[PDB]
Design a protein around this ligand. Structure first.
Ligand SMILES: [Mg+2]
Ligand SMILES: [Mg+2]
Ligand SMILES: [Mg+2]
Ligand SMILES: [Mg+2]
Ligand SMILES: [Mg+2]
Ligand SMILES: [Mg+2]
Ligand SMILES: [Mg+2]
Ligand SMILES: [Mg+2]
Ligand SMILES: [Mg+2]
Ligand SMILES: [Mg+2]
Ligand SMILES: [Mg+2]
Ligand SMILES: [Mg+2]
Ligand SMILES: [Mg+2]
Ligand SMILES: [Mg+2]
Ligand SMILES: [Mg+2]
Ligand SMILES: [Mg+2]
Ligand SMILES: [Mg+2]
Ligand SMILES: [Mg+2]
Ligand SMILES: [Mg+2]
Ligand SMILES: [Mg+2]
Ligand SMILES: [Mg+2]
Ligand SMILES: [Mg+2]
Ligand SMILES: [Mg+2]
Ligand SMILES: [Mg+2]
Ligand SMILES: [Mg+2]
Ligand SMILES: [Mg+2]
Ligand SMILES: [Mg+2]
Ligand SMILES: [Mg+2]
Ligand SMILES: [Mg+2]
Ligand SMILES: [Mg+2]
Ligand SMILES: [Mg+2]
Ligand SMILES: [Mg+2]
Ligand SMILES: [Mg+2]
Ligand SMILES: [Mg+2]
Ligand SMILES: [Mg+2]
Ligand SMILES: [Mg+2]
Ligand SMILES: [Mg+2]
Ligand SMILES: [Mg+2]
Ligand SMILES: [Mg+2]
Ligand SMILES: [Mg+2]
Ligand SMILES: [Mg+2]
Ligand SMILES: [Mg+2]
Ligand SMILES: [Mg+2]
Ligand SMILES: [Mg+2]
Ligand SMILES: [Mg+2]
Ligand SMILES: [Mg+2]
Ligand SMILES: [Mg+2]
Ligand SMILES: [Mg+2]
Ligand SMILES: [Mg+2]
Lengths: 64, 201, 117, 143
RNA sequence: UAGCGGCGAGCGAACGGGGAGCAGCCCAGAGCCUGAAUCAGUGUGUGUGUUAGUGGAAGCGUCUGGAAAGGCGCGCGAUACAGGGUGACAGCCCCGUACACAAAAAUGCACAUGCUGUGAGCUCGAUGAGUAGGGCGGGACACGUGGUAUCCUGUCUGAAUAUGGGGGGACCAUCCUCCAAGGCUAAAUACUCCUGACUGACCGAUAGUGAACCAGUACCGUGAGGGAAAGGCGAAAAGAACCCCGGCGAGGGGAGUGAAAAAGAACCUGAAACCGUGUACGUACAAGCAGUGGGAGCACGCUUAGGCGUGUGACUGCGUACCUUUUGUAUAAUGGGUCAGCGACUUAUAUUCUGUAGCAAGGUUAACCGAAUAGGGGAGCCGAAGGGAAACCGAGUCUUAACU
């Protein structure tokens, strides 16, 4: 019947306006004193997925 | 649009967005196909290899016999095994849109008036339900294959046309493109012209 | 629908068996081996429509070599003499003349000899 | 115009691949699937978000955020929707009757999008700066 | 979707809205109207339905043929041209159907309604205790103890009781709403071992049930159980009188019926592998995927003798099967004895993309009604606005104290 949405991908992506997908960055959960400060200052803002993996996350989130 | 009658020689006026448009071959073909595919009743079933009445044992053991590998006597490659891809009671109802169906009916009505096959009359009336009189009246009007779609309800014409094997008597509401295409000379009551100009608008 | 398929197999196997009449053995009655005989025979026909021109080129060349050495010249000196006298007569015609009508071949031999010498 | 001569538009009905029906069929003895894989086996294939045994992308990346209950029950209304409602007054019950937002919409907004011409008296709706300026240039009474 | 989730695989509501259908009452108890609403059970009469049934229209002459229902011309019925037969395709030969009627008897039902139990009706009072909650251990709700609401209880415990209590998704206070711990209840909905009518872009004997037949039979198994094959003469048996060979047999030959016996029961059609016979050609000095290119001769058929074709093929150049799996096959790697029949990318529901049709800031309806593929139904869905974790802002928005 209706296609099941992978709820991990629904809780880790958002579909933006033109069609791309945005997500939070990696390596920002624990050990963080040995990482620098510009690394965390650039891992802060959310950003878009690349060319290839967009088909995989479209297959996990078929309901937009 | 200025239709002319024959038996009264009057003239009805109905607009060209109902009786004067252009013949849309693809749209009328899709609605005719969907009409036949809704007319399909579709009740067949075959026996699956989950439904063939048999055992469940391997007919012989796997290794050590000179015969093939086989593990169910029900198998679709065997004799009196299941159909491999067994069917089901199903529903094939294609869904034509409302505006598509009305555009098809507008198209064939325009095509009937362009091809000159929709004889319009002021009324159709027989006194007693005698099919002998109805075939008499139709031979007088010089038709063989004829669809008389009625302005108002005429149960006497129902009774007089139930047994003729070429004549068809309908309502202007319950019309359908398979009938309105297949029947060679469509006879329309002027009241049915009024009802279908209402019906398509 | 239940498309029963007896007549289709009969028409196809009859066409292949009719193509495979004349062959020895079970290769004209069995279908499973007459199909291999038909396909391999058509393969050989495709190869031999190229090979026939090779074989007949070598046959004409051998016949002109024989008639030229009966008239006192080798075949290579003959063909160089003809190209130096500017004659375009090909060797099928040359070999047919060499068999049927030999005094015209002596005419060809003397014109080639007068060209080459 | 008979029943048989209703040929379609050239381009409507596609052929449809019949897989595995000969050499000249194109889709030959394998049927588009290659040789001996796991994607060639009957019922073969992998689930969604499978990149071999490594972590898929939706497990490498971290989560973010919750979802608010107030989000789905607040709908936007274009300026062109305000000429759909019959009466020249716009409130939530009038709009929900006029089939604009839906029965599950409590708060609402009005957006500068599209043009409005007639006078329209918006009550009880939060309106943005551009849409509010457009309404009071059209002759409305926003409150 | 919100959620649950080694937050993995997956599981997945509800609030709300459209429809189908809609029926509400009693004991928790006494007085006083005192038999009225009522349902259950038992019966007389009407109507309707079932179990037998009855009537039921309308055609002839000729050529073909074994036979006409066929062709030819000429008529008639039709509220009946649905169908099934009949010596070849029948509205008018038969059985029917449409329609119009018919049941002494049992009878399902709508009741008209008698009989037996039954009491509505009024007022005052009563407001379901080892129970709700609680600790522990489990289970059901989408919810896996998680911050876990709510429901059930295996065990220990345990109140208030209408100023009281339950709930409103930990919990607390206001508010809203409702009154558990005793019952009963029609309909819409699920199903077909059956009993009839009807339909099939369902099968037509390796199919359809396993079973067109004297099948869960033969048969196998101690037993549970497993489980086949097997339809067709013709129109009607008119199923071969008689005679001959033979063993007072089998089988045949003539005669006979016959449209047909090359339809004779081992029976319509009668294919292929396979096995023979008769004729033309080749074959007993010859090497191998057996063919193909060339090619004399021989025989048979034809004619501007000429020309050819058809059958054969001495001799000769080339030529190491097919499939699969492979870096790679004549491979001495796999599979096939051959034929005939069956045998393997389908279906449902969603989504994305392309092609095409309809309408185009709009497009479309789903259930359901509707003797019904029409038309209603706009509940909903998608799109016209994005940004943000979110509130909120909105052609901008987020970051930031603020961004050029
Ligand atoms: Mg953190
Ligand atoms: Mg077992
Ligand atoms: Mg069987
Ligand atoms: Mg079967
Ligand atoms: Mg509709
Ligand atoms: Mg069939
Ligand atoms: Mg043969
Ligand atoms: Mg060459
Ligand atoms: Mg290919
Ligand atoms: Mg393979
Ligand atoms: Mg491989
Ligand atoms: Mg592969
Ligand atoms: Mg499988
Ligand atoms: Mg690993
Ligand atoms: Mg709405
Ligand atoms: Mg009768
Ligand atoms: Mg009769
Ligand atoms: Mg016959
Ligand atoms: Mg109580
Ligand atoms: Mg008690
Ligand atoms: Mg207790
Ligand atoms: Mg308790
Ligand atoms: Mg508790
Ligand atoms: Mg508990
Ligand atoms: Mg409780
Ligand atoms: Mg609360
Ligand atoms: Mg058969
Ligand atoms: Mg059978
Ligand atoms: Mg005898
Ligand atoms: Mg036999
Ligand atoms: Mg027959
Ligand atoms: Mg026979
Ligand atoms: Mg045979
Ligand atoms: Mg010899
Ligand atoms: Mg040898
Ligand atoms: Mg040749
Ligand atoms: Mg290998
Ligand atoms: Mg390879
Ligand atoms: Mg090799
Ligand atoms: Mg081998
Ligand atoms: Mg060998
Ligand atoms: Mg192997
Ligand atoms: Mg193999
Ligand atoms: Mg083998
Ligand atoms: Mg075969
Ligand atoms: Mg098949
Ligand atoms: Mg699709
Ligand atoms: Mg389009
Ligand atoms: Mg910007």
């Amino acid at each position: 019947p209706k296609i099941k949405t992978v709820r991990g991908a629904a809780k880790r992506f958002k579909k933006t306006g033109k069609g791309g997908f945005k997500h939070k960055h990696a390596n920002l959960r624990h050990i963080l004193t040995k990482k620098a400060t510009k690394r965390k200052r650039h891992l802060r803002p959310k950003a878009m997925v690349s060319k290839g993996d967009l088909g995989l996350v479209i297959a996990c989130l078929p309901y937009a | 649009m200025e239709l002319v009658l024959k038996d009264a020689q009057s003239a009805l006026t109905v607009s060209e967005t109902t009786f004067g448009r252009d013949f849309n071959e693809a749209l009328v073909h899709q609605v005719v196909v969907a009409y036949a595919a809704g007319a399909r009743q579709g009740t067949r079933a075959q026996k699956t290899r989950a439904e063939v009445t048999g055992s469940g044992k391997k007919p012989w053991r796997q290794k050590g016999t000179g015969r093939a590998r086989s593990g169910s006597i029900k198998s679709p490659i065997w004799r009196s095994g299941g159909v491999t891809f067994a069917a089901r009671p199903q529903d094939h109802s294609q869904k034509v849109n409302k505006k598509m169906y009305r555009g098809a009916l507008k198209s064939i009505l325009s095509e009937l008036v362009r091809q000159d096959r929709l004889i319009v009359v002021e009324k159709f009336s027989v006194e007693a339900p005698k099919t002998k009189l109805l075939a008499q009246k139709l031979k007088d009007m010089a038709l063989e294959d004829v669809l008389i779609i009625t302005g108002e309800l005429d149960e006497n014409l129902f009774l007089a046309a139930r047994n003729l094997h070429k004549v068809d008597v309908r309502d202007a509401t319950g019309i359908d493109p398979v009938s309105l295409i297949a029947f060679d000379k469509v006879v329309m009551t002027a009241d049915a012209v009024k009802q279908v100009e209402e019906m398509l608008a | 629908a239940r498309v029963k398929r007896g007549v289709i197999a009969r028409a196809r196997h009859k066409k292949i068996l009719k193509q495979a009449k004349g062959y020895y053995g079970a290769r004209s009655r069995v279908y499973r081996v007459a199909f291999q005989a038909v396909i391999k025979a058509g393969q050989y026909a495709y190869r031999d429509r190229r090979q026939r021109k090779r074989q007949f080129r070598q046959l004409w060349i051998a016949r002109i070599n024989a008639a030229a050495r009966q008239n006192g010249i080798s075949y290579s000196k003959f063909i160089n003499g003809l190209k130096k006298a500017s004659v375009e007569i090909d060797r099928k015609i040359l070999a047919d003349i060499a068999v049927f009508d030999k005094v015209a071949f002596t005419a060809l031999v003397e014109k080639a000899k007068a060209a080459l010498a | 115009m008979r029943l048989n001569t209703l040929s379609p538009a050239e381009g409507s009905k596609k052929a449809g691949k019949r897989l595995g029906r000969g050499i000249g069929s194109g889709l030959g003895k394998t049927g588009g699937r290659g040789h001996k894989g796991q994607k060639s086996r009957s019922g073969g294939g992998v689930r969604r978000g499978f990149e071999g045994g490594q972590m898929p992308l939706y497990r490498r990346l971290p989560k973010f955020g919750f979802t608010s209950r107030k989000a789905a029950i607040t709908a936007e209304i274009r300026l062109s929707d305000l000429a759909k409602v019959e009466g020249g007054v716009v409130d939530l019950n009038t709009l929900k009757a006029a089939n604009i937002i839906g029965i599950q919409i409590e708060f609402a907004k009005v957006i500068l999008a599209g043009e409005v011409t007639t006078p329209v008296t918006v009550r009880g709706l939060r309106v943005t700066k551009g849409a509010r300026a457009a309404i009071e240039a059209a002759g409305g009474k926003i409150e």
